[PDB]
Amino acid sequence: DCPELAVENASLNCSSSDRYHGAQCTVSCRTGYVLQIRRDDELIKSQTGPSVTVTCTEGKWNKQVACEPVDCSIPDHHQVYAASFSCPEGTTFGSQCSFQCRHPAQLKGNNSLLTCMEDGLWSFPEALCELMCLAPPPVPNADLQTARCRENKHKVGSFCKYKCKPGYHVPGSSRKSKKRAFKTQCTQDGSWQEGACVPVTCDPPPPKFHGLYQCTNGFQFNSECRIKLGSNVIHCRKDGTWNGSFHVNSNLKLQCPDGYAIGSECATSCLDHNSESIILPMNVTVRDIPHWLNPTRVERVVCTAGLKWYPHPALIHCVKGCEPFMGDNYCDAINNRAFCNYDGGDCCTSTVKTKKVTPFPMSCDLQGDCACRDPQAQEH
Amino acid sequence: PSRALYFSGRGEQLRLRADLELPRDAFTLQVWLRAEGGQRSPAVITGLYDKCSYISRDRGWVVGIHTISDQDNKDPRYFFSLKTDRARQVTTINAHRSYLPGQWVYLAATYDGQFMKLYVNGAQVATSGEQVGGIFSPLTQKCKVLMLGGSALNHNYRGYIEHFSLWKVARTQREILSDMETHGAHTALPQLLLQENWDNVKHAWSPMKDGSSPKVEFSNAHGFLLDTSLEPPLCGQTLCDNTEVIASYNQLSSFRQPKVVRYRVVNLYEDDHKNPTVTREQVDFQHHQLAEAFKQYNISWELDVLEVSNSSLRRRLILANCDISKIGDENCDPECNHTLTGHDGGDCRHLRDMDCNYEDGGECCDPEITNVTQTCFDPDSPHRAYLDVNELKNILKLDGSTHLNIFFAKSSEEELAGVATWPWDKEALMHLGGIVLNPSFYGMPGHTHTMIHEIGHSLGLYHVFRGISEIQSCSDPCMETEPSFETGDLCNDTNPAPKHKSCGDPGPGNDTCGFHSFFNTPYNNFMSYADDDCTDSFTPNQVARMHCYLDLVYQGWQPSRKPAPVALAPQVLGHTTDSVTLEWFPPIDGHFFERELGSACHLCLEGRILVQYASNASSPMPCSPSGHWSPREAEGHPDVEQPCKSSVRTWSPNSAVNPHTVPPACPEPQGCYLELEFLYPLVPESLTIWVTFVSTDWDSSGAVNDIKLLAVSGKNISLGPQNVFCDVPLTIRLWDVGEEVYGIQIYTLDEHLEIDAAMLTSTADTPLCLQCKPLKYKVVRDPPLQMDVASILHLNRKFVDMDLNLGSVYQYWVITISGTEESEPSPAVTYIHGSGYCGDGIIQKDQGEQCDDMNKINGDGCSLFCRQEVSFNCIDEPSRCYFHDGDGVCEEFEQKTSIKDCGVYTPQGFLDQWASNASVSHQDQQCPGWVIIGQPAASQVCRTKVIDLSEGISQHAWYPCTISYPYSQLAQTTFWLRAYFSQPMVAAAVIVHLVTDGTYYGDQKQETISVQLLDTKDQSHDLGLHVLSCRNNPLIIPVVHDLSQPFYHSQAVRVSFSSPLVAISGVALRSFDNFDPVTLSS
Amino acid sequence: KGRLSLQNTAEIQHCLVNAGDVGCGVFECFENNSCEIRGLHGICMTFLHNAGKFDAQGKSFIKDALKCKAHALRHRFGCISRKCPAIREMVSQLQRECYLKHDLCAAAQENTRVIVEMIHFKDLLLHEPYVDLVNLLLTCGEEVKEAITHSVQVQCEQNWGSLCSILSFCTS
Ligand SMILES: [Zn+2]
């Protein structure tokens, strides 16, 4: 004779008064509870469904059923956008979870609780964290053309147009063309995208009185350049116009026609044409350059006032010059540097039509000498 | 009236206006759509997408057309996906058939909260019950938008949309069927949200601000109320393989009237009229013997011997079964083995001038040195010795429309004659079709009956051993193990037979895959391979087919002016208290006009529409500068038996090359092209192209790169690239073509594209069918009608009569007169004015009606002969039907048929026992070990290259979760499923049910599991290893045991595998329910 | 084995139209063929494996020669007769007209030691393009021919002793 069986969270609507060999009893779980079966002894099975039939055999029941609760998932995403979930009890049926929005996201809605419903899923969020970007940082040297941008209420993806004040401009255009209009928009994170106006650099002088020049502010705005009639003061106005021009080696070889006399350009080249000379005055040698450094091309040294005090043909270093391997879909480890324009972009996958990189020697390691070290590619 | 939107693929799509409250909890879509041929792969019809969110863009629901095998895009089905905001997995519901590209489909999808269902043409097709709850929160009601005909990612739709309708509540199948018959003339309801018939699009819909609204046309969905198209069976080929058309030629005897069929004999001579191919006494002996064997079957042959004299054709060898590729290929073959073929060019002789000619560079082929016919076998020579018969018919260019051509060919094989042409081939009436015979057997007294066998192949009769001998695999769709009208020979009288040569019933053998003892085999029939003496007569069910193809395809051969009869009985559509409305089918050959020779009246359709195929085809040679060879297999009506497997009856860009030449790739900016030309240039309305085979990958999105329509005035109107499908023919609708088009050019970039045919449908009223006089139908009654009613002739197929009495029977048959000549009558329909019929909607099982709705349409679950369809089930008194293979509920009838829905089918001599107390190794919180117990649900579909298993699989299955992907591949561990059992029985078979094969998306290496076995107080008895397959999803592992070794009472089964992706849902143990071999061998 | 039919022509054609002409992908697709014309892939790997010892004139020659060989193979492998003598003829013709028009003699005269210390004698007895490069290399300079024969004479003692008595038995 079988013992009386009680199974938690169910409904034992069976009337086996005598629990003999053949005590046919039925077990059905309640709402929000699924059925687990850990059988003991059985011959054949049938698809009962959400319920089950448990039979007595030799003083024991043939099944050991248990209505375990349904398991809602731990809420990671897909319920509230950009919020943190802190369930204090658990992730079973009847449990309720509380969520709080991130710092720059106001909440709209009275009820902010997620309930693990009877279907095994979370409930609908009655309150949604409204994502609104805050007030922008006031960028100096800019005109706030959009009147709403001085407030704090801005929708995500707004278009605030900032026009730079005169004497300043957004970077991108040189000293010839002036552009001062740029767009800053609210990101999906909730912060405004960064953008600022830089001052317009005053125009460089002719090299006749360079080296002994003493500008008041240098390359900054309103810089009056005058050495220690003509142009006694040079006014760097808002357009940057120069009102008046200034008024009065063993390896490297240069043969100027004037020589010690002034006014003539000199042909600047090394002993071998494979090398290129560059101006490196800040105690940086030929081999001491990094790959991200961008030195300038050699300027033909015009004779200034007195003796040339421009970087001396000695300060000018003949370095390993570029080679005609640009843009042929082949990456060169020698030309994998910013000086030779990153081999025309051949060493970076985003600037090759074959969408691949092929190092010229088989040995070259793909993360070593012949790697895409250009930040202007799609790798960053 | 009723107006529809033609959506092109160019970017036309719409958007529902903001004033409509979208359905939140339950909804019902009801759209009449006519899709075109080749859509895009994910192409949608109506979606409800999320536009204010970025965490998941796959919310809401989408109804559309998408292929279920996305790796190959083979068969495109209608689909209905749904993902609520609460749920975690988007579940799709497909259809049961590849869609029809030219029919109006009442696609309707409903969702109530628990079960989402899809209704294609009123029948419930597939139902899934995974999505629960409302499909969005009411807080985000203003954020959801509804798009019609496309999405924001531009899954554009190519076709028509006729009557869009959206509901705020879920309507069951009785309301869906009521909405089909009432169309869009519907009153206002609170539940009816949007019910749009396109008379003012801008009132409720707004297009994209950058795109354009699709153009509004005129079209009618209710164009036919009786479906005139009958599908041939699963191994038939024409209209007369249908079960109820061949039966009407068997019961009736006025369809087997005496017919005189003309035929010709192509007799070749030299330029002096002295030496024949067949002598005059051979022709005279054959024809009297030919009419002797057919005079008892009402078939008479009128002989017209044609003699053509050409000494170039006569002196050389003519062969039939010898292919031209194997002459250049070095693989030997018996069909090309002659002194006039060079013994296949030396490729068949045992030794590998007469003996030095084996493929002398034109020295033995030039006529100035020696005769060409002696020792020249060059396959590209202008003059050669062997001549294929398909070239011979091209040389003669005879007429096949008014005669049956018989050619002659000597062959080394000669066990049969040459290959006769079936009536369903494209060359049935062309000049390249006919019967090729052996000229030295035609008329000889020992082999007279081999012409009767070749005649019957040319009139639609298969071999008697087609259902047994000509079976390529025992898993065939039809294999004649039982006599039936749809299996094997398609004749009920012909018992199954194997391939035999001796007379009488054959001895038993293991060659037959499903039978051992054949009784009363048709040894006496002509279709067997028996000798002349034992072949005497045709079965009387092989003269129903012979008298049918002389009405369907071969009307032009016979000089009788009697038109083709209506081979099907009239059908009753509806009735009232006074009148009964009946419609009938068009006559059996399908022509809707009088057969007037020298015109286009053999091509027009009902409503003055000219439909024509490609007449002349040209394409440039790939290995020549100015080749321009003319392909032939891309001309006529499309004939491919398997429409996705590559065949030989299509045009391929690499088919034009020599077999000894590397094929070149097609050029980049325009590609290789095929230039088809149509016989009658018309103002086109639609263009359908049967692209059969596409390579599995393409660079451009469309396989057909460009299509340019030619014109008589030279203006090449170009069309864009189209996305073609393997099965469905590509169909293009052509607007604003004001110039007549005489042909198309199909530029392609795929190397192995296989264009099969083309079709240019003309406009609504073509100026070429205007001189065709229509044929008129007259309907007679068995109690005869009045002279005011029975005299008149019905141009339409619709007839009504008013004088009826409520008790008496009435038989109606319709004759189909053309001019003065009246055809044979149709089979009669027995009608009583009080009782029912096959469209009443009251199912009366005494008359044989298995189902009865009012559709009279074969596309639903109930046919127009009151028969339920293949894999359908009808469950109401007006017989609404549903598709039961994919539903989640098992029934009593479904247990023996669907293993994938009613569990594993235990054999009648055995008994299944499923596992209990099953223990595993890597048990965790995510995947526990109690899931193996009991019978698994078979509704879990197989996983094709599963990458991630983060969904809810472990609640209904088991795969290891502690060891992830990288540690399992590197360290090479092992996992086991040490399953126990409860009742100790012996092992006859071990069943293991898997939800996946373990195949990874990246790793394509096959992985193997081990099925061991454990018992009481001993070690084991190994059963071996087995690989995993989805079609073998219940992997039955047969136990190997020898009767000399004493038996063992099995207790446990252990399954071990090292790959992490193999998932086990439940193991079993099949035993003997008859006897126990332990107490027997105690 | 006289036909390339045993290896699918589509397999070698699809790989060729899938690959690029810049690297050694064309010869990688080409090497598994029914005829035994193996050896172009080894030449590509050896030329792109020891590119460091080549001067700028030599590296430019190697780049342009492998580019022309890949492009010419993908171009004229379109239509050809399918027989191994014809495949050998088109391969040797494309290799010869590729090396002659990009100044192989200049690359031999500039840096001879790197180009002659790459004989690969054991590979040569079973790779026809290696024999093609050998019989095109020696026609430029006399000291190049004498040095490469001096290396081969030691490589006889490495590999085969009969060749040292066959090849030295000339003009006597
Ligand atoms: Zn036959």
Numbering used by the authors:
A (entry chain A): 1134 to 1361, 1371 to 1390, 1405 to 1536
B (entry chain B): 13 to 364, 378 to 384, 389 to 1111
C (entry chain C): 42 to 213
Question: What do the study's own words say?
Answer:
Next, we recombinantly overexpressed PAPP-A in suspended HEK293F cells to biochemically study the enzymatic properties of PAPP-A. The conserved core catalytic Glu483 residue was mutated to Alanine (E483A) to avoid auto-cleavage and serve as the loss-of-function control. After the proteins were purified to homogeneity, cryo-EM was applied and a final 3.8 Å-resolution half-density map was obtained using a similar strategy as for PAPP-A·proMBP. The map revealed an extra component in the structure, which was then identified to be the co-purified endogenous STC2. Besides, Cys120 links to Cys652 of PAPP-A and locates at the PAPP-A–STC2 interface. The interface of SD with STC2 is similar to that with proMBP where Cys120 of STC2 is linked to the same Cys652 of PAPP-A, and the interface of STC2 with CTD comprises a hydrogen bond involving Met1518 and π–cation interactions involving Phe1481, which also resembles the CTD–proMBP interface. In contrast, the PD from PAPP-A·STC2 complex is only attached to the SD without interacting with any other domains. The K128BP5/K120BP4 anchor residues interact with Asn683 and His781 of PAPP-A, both of which are exactly located at the interface between proMBP (or STC2) and PAPP-A. Thus, upon the formation of the disulfide bond between Cys169 of proMBP and Cys652 of PAPP-A (or Cys120 of STC2 and Cys652 of PAPP-A), it is expected that the binding of the anchor peptide would be prohibited.
Originally discovered in the circulation of pregnant women as a protein secreted by placental trophoblasts, the metalloprotease pregnancy-associated plasma protein A (PAPP-A) is also widely expressed by many other tissues. It cleaves insulin-like growth factor-binding proteins (IGFBPs) to increase the bioavailability of IGFs and plays essential roles in multiple growth-promoting processes. While the vast majority of the circulatory PAPP-A in pregnancy is proteolytically inactive due to covalent inhibition by proform of eosinophil major basic protein (proMBP), the activity of PAPP-A can also be covalently inhibited by another less characterized modulator, stanniocalcin-2 (STC2). Here we present two cryo-EM structures of endogenous purified PAPP-A in complex with either proMBP or STC2. Both modulators form 2:2 heterotetramer with PAPP-A and establish extensive interactions with multiple domains of PAPP-A that are distal to the catalytic cleft.
